[PDB]
């Protein structure tokens, strides 16, 4: 099927037998689609093995894919490796039984719901004030990773199960131990593997390999049992068991499988994407004063946030969005065509993957002025109406957006304001000036960020 889009008329770069173009994958998923996109323009296709994959760029056409025929036609996303019983999880799920997990699990999500879980996110604000104080009243750099990796993991764990542990200082503890474990290496020798050979994956499904290691999911699978076993609470685990006694229902076999994508989206973004904006800000001090003097403006001698403060920071949501839009680590969305289709004038044959190139459109200078720096003024509020939403795509669009985006933003923030508050950061030793992002198959420094951390 490598002759597909050569009978289409669309461009792309002529791809190998057997392995389509996953050789350029050579300097990441990132490069790969900058290039295509100055060679080809608007519309260009590649192979991710035999896979044809279609890389959309128009707004229009973004919006009818990811909108406009979300339901009828690019439904799902490309099928992943050996998943198991974690099939039944919502980013993975298809059509009508995708349909069914998103509406069961919508009322978790909501901003009423968000409300309640401030004052448990909030307590960890503290927490990783206190682990920041011990390195920097000693003077010691702090690699973010591990700090806030550490913040990130009290969060998921609280607001998921309620389970309350310093993971920074306990390390050992039998539920920080196996959700920190995890093969965490898409260009890796096994994803890379899996686009070659797809029809291998069927095999690790009889064989009982799963991508999550067993022991990790057994380990979860039990927990869980032993907190129904146990049912105020208004963490995550409570949300979807009251949402069992309460359009079909949640089994407890899908509630284990859905909680678990929590931990896993919540832990690794979360952290990376706040390392990603203390990288900005101490590169930027004249970013990271103003956002300074913002939350002291909105919270005065050190107030503690609450969700309605939070909303009220203007320039805190515009450095948010500016290290998301040069740092958008899903890098991309997909969509599968479930039909022969024609939208916006142009026709997509079935089975083919459409991909909107979130990395390539964020550092477009078609629609981004100086793409490459960082300029949180592009979203201040009068130059904010300026971007097309459809360009800038941090969390998906249409019904099938990152159904944690409010969440997300709140536990970040949170996270930024109690942290300013109190400190302050520069650059150290190893900062890395310019920032290398990992040639692999996901968004982050080549070398993990670290900085000098000064007590206010
Ligand atoms: C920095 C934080 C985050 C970013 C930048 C982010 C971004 C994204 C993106 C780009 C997608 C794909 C949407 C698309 O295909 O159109 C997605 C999907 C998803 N995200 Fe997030 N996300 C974040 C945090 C979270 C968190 C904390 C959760 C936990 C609840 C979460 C849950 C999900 C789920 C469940 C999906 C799949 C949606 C579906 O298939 O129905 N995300 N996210
Ligand atoms: C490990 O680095 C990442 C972790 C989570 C996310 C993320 C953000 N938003 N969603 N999300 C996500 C991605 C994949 C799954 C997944 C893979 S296999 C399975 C059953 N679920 C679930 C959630 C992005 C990067």
């Known amino acids: 099927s ?8 669309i461009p792309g770069p002529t791809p190998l037998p057997f392995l389509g173009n996953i050789l350029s994958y050579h300097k990441g998923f990132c ?14 296709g590649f192979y991710d093995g035999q896979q044809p994959v279609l890389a959309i760029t128009d707004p229009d056409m973004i919006k009818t894919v990811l909108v406009k025929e979300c339901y009828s036609v690019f439904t799902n996303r490309r099928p992943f490796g050996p998943v198991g019983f974690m099939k039944s999880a919502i980013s993975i799920a298809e059509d009508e039984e995708w349909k069914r997990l998103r509406s069961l699990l919508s009322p978790t999500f909501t901003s009423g719901k968000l409300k309640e879980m401030v004052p448990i996110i909030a307590q960890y604000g503290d927490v990783l004030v206190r682990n920041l104080r011990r390195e920097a009243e000693t003077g010691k750099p702090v690699t973010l990773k591990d700090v806030f990796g550490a913040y990130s993991m009290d969060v998921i764990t609280s607001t998921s199960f309620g389970v309350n542990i310093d993971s920074l200082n306990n ?17 890796d020798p096994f994803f890379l593997s899996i686009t070659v050979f797809p029809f291998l994956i069927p095999i690790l499904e009889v064989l009982n390999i ?31 068991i009251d949402s069992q006694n309460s359009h079909k229902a949640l089994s407890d076999l899908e509630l284990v499988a859905q909680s678990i994508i929590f931990i896993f989206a919540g832990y690794e973004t979360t952290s990376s994407v706040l390392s990603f904006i203390m990288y900005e800000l101490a590169t930027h001090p004249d970013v990271q ?34 290290t998301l839009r040069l740092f958008p ?55 904010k109406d300026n971007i097309d939403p459809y360009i800038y795509t941090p969390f998906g669009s249409g019904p099938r957006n990152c159904i944690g985006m409010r969440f997300a933003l709140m536990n970040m923030k949170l996270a930024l304001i109690r942290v300013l508050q109190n400190f302050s950061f520069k650059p150290c030793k190893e900062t890395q000036i310019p ?10 420094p080549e070398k993990p960020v ?7």
């Open 435 to 444: 920032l290398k992002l990992s040639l692999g198959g996901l968004l982050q």
């Open 450 to 456: 670290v900085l000098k951390v000064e007590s206010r």
């Open 329 to 383: 680590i899903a890098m991309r969305l997909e969509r599968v065509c479930k039909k022969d289709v024609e939208i916006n004038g142009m026709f997509i044959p079935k089975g083919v993957v459409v991909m909107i190139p979130s990395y390539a459109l964020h550092r477009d200078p078609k629609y981004w002025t100086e793409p490459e720096k960082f300029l949180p003024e592009r979203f201040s509020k009068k130059n």
């Open 210 to 240: 799963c991508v999550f290691p067993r022991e990790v999911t057994n380990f979860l699978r039990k927990s869980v049992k032993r907190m129904k076993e146990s049912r105020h609470r208004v963490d995550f685990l409570q949300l979807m």
């Open 171 to 187: 390390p050992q503890d039998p539920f920080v131990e196996n959700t920190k474990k995890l093969l965490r290496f898409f260009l």
């Open 31 to 44: 490069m790969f689609d900058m290039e295509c996109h100055k060679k080809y323009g608007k519309v260009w």
């Open 289 to 322: 004063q103003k956002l300074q003097e913002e939350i002291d403006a909105v919270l005065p001698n050190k107030a503690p946030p609450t969700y309605d403060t939070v909303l009220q920071m203007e320039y805190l949501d515009m450095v948010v969005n500016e």
């Open 2 to 9: 490598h002759g597909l889009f050569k009978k289409l008329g």
